[PDB]
A paper describes a structure:
The VACV strain Western Reserve F9 ectodomain, consisting of residues 1–176 with an added N-terminal 6-histidine tag, was refolded from bacterially-produced inclusion bodies and purified to near homogeneity by immobilized metal affinity chromatography (IMAC) and size exclusion chromatography (SEC). F9 crystallized with four molecules in the asymmetric unit of the crystal used for data collection for refinement, resulting in the 2.10 Å structure. The F9 ectodomain exhibits a bundle of five α-helices (α) packed against two pairs of β-sheets (β). Between α3 and α4, a loop of 12 amino acids protrudes starting with Gly90 and ending with Ser101. As the transmembrane domain begins after the α5 helix, both ends of F9 are close to each other and to the viral membrane. The atomic structure revealed that Cys33 and Cys55, Cys47 and Cys127, and Cys107 and Cys149 form three pairs of disulfide bonds. Cys47 is located in β2 and together with Cys127 it forms a disulfide bond, which stabilizes the β-sheet pairs at the bottom of the molecule. In F9, α3 turns proximal whereas in L1 α3 is located sideward forming the entrance into the hydrophobic cavity. This cavity is missing in F9, although a hydrophobic area similar to L1 is found. With regard to the divergence of F9, its differing orientation of helix α3, its absence of a myristoylation site, and its lack of a hydrophobic cavity likely contribute to F9 functional differences from L1.
Poxviruses are unique in requiring eleven transmembrane proteins that form the entry fusion complex (EFC). The fusion apparatus is embedded in the MV membrane and consists of eleven proteins namely A1610, A2111, A2812, F913, G314, G915, H216, J517, L118, L519, and O320, which comprise the entry fusion complex (EFC). F9, the subject of this study, is a 23.8 kDa protein with a putative transmembrane domain near the C-terminus. Here, we report the 2.10 Å structure of F9 and demonstrate a fold similar to L1 but without a hydrophobic cavity.
Author numbering: 2 to 166
Write the structure that this text describes.
Amino acid sequence: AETKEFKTLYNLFIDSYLQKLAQHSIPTNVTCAIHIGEVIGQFKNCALRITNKCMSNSRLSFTLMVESFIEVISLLPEKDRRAIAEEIGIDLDDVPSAVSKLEKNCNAYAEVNNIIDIQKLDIGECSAPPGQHMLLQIVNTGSAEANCGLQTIVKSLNKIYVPPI
């Protein structure tokens, strides 16, 4: 039959984040200044879903990006929440609109990185047991700094397994 989904926390995050992206479209899209043209990682039974859904500014991306992270991470024990939040660079006490260290780290990476309209994205490890698949929805928001934020979140939440239900 068809392979069953090997769900992780990133699935919960992206599903939350995609809902917010659809609402915060004022038009439908603007001119996507950047596109995802290159995905790297270690693939075993990987299911990638690449979509464009770009918007006006990265601050709005990171805001809903942070709302979803806080919303999803709360399903973890206390010490697990603060530990991963510190690795990504998000403060669980700040309001979801506060510029996290993640966003500043991403904004700073964009100031030196290679200009051009194509972005490479590293999804880390996309592996699932035989008979299963890891769905990994990657959304381009037309910003190099926002795509950097999603990448950091992928490479962390993707390692945390959600038992099936």
